[PDB]
Symmetry: C4
Subunit: 162 residues, 4 copies
Amino acid sequence: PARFYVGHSIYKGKAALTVDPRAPEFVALDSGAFKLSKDGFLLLQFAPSAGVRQYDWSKKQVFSLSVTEIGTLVSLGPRESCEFFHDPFKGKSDEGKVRKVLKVEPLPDGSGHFFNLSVQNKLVNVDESIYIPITRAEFAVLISAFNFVLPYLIGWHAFANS
Amino acid sequence: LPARFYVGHSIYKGKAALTVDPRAPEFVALDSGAFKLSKDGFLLLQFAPSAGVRQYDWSKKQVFSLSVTEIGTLVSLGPRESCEFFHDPFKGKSDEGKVRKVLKVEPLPDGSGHFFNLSVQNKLVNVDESIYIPITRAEFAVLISAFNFVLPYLIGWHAFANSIKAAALEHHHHHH
Amino acid sequence: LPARFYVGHSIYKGKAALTVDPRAPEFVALDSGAFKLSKDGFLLLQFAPSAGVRQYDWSKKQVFSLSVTEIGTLVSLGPRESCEFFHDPFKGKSDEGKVRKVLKVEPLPDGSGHFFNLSVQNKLVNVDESIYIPITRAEFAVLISAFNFVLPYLIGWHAFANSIKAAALEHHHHHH
Amino acid sequence: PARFYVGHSIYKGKAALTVDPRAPEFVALDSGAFKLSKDGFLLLQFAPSAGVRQYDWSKKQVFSLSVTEIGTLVSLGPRESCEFFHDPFKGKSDEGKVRKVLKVEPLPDGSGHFFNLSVQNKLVNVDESIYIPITRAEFAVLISAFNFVLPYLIGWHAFANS
Ligand code: NI
Ligand code: NI
């Protein structure tokens, strides 16, 4: 029953990014076995700076990277760009009112990358965009982490008990 | 008993679905109480045709196992290299030669994705059917990640790796 | 208490030795009983000069820590790319600016190996010393394997990954 | 205390190869901690065929691949050759009487590889050479296994208890 908070953070002049792994969900079967019913994912939390070495997490914006989206990121060319579009209320009533776009791209003339999260949310009147540049080494740690975590998110470390 | 987990990974498309399930290696107990690997694990691919909007008819499914060596082929493929595998599910058994399955894995025409195509000729029941499914680049990358990850588990080396600490705790040298 | 393991990995050469030790991340208990990551792990490199035939003087050793981000640099290097890291062991402390350490990692001249060179200027004790060690291609490949392996452990993600099963056993959905 | 035999075998027309992982050794310290004192390694066991789908393991020859040698193999170019020379009695009295050479090379005009183990042993009057060709897929499984096992052989999975 041990529970771990192991967010990985990158702190820059104007913004911070925290990446938190989230476990898959399971359903109990009639037989007493468990079936994976939802994949794990990574929760990305972006916040603006508010003073030297501080960030305002009350103004955070979040974006969930799915297993397939992680697939995109680990298979990217060294200088390939990508973009992901989420409506958090697809298939619900509030559909269309919250729009989130995550861009991940190489930095211009540089060896690092940026992450940018824009969120337009009409339910709470928020229109926000947080940009954060990452060094090559920082990106390499992310990619190492993403590659490592993928099989765990789909539960494959957990077959083969016995 | 320890918990048993089902962790099928699925891709759902317009005309077909694919589910991939890992199957554990088998071991035997020895007289000494040691466990010997008796059968490698494998992956089971299950393909099913669409029956309406994002529903599939699993009573019409066709299946194909991927062995450790076939996974080796898949993980070592060039970026746009094709491969093809030929199976007789009853090879060496009495229905040998009755059923032939062909799995093709190839890049999509002028695209960055792949397809899997499973063709089955079953002469026991007069079935000659094929199921095709497209896989995006991102989806394929998840598959290849999973395949690379699972390979050492399928050959039992995980069990070795994870027995090291507990073993050291009982068998170690002591100073003089 | 659980067993504690020392697993230093060493390379011994003609004029110098290098030992690399992993250091675990630190966690804190929370009021809820949950554990929060409080400090990333790192690697400690310890370099020592030869004192005779394959003996080294560890009382003359110089050390250098590699952070998670520095390991990121190392694992992402081009095949013959150079890198260099600059440390002040007392940065932010009262001895800030007294001690400077530089680690260089570069390919060997017209060879397939690498060297590590650690230079230390310690103005507290009038020490200005450097230790150089050559690393073969095979040795470097072991280091890079180890570094890639350890990175998710150093950020605590292993602890996450390995808590999944046990957690599912208690928290899961039940049918209706 | 669970013990596993998980040899991985490749069986061909004239020869078989079995690869068995071997755990590192530890010494108990005064403090109750344990220190890694010998790296793990891989034991390669080669045997000649003796009839259809059978091999004579009484005529086996063996070669221990060290962590550094595994380093060589995982960092090889796609068609790079390598060779390893062992005297099993270096630093002992019988030094010089047993000579073993393992060659691993791409197959000529082919995408597979071969392993060849030659052993000249004057202590028991053995002069033997076992050659086995491996397919690209079979080699890819080996390399996957070798990459996977390396950090375990040096005990790195075992730091961070607590
Ligand atoms: Ni003891
Ligand atoms: Ni329950």
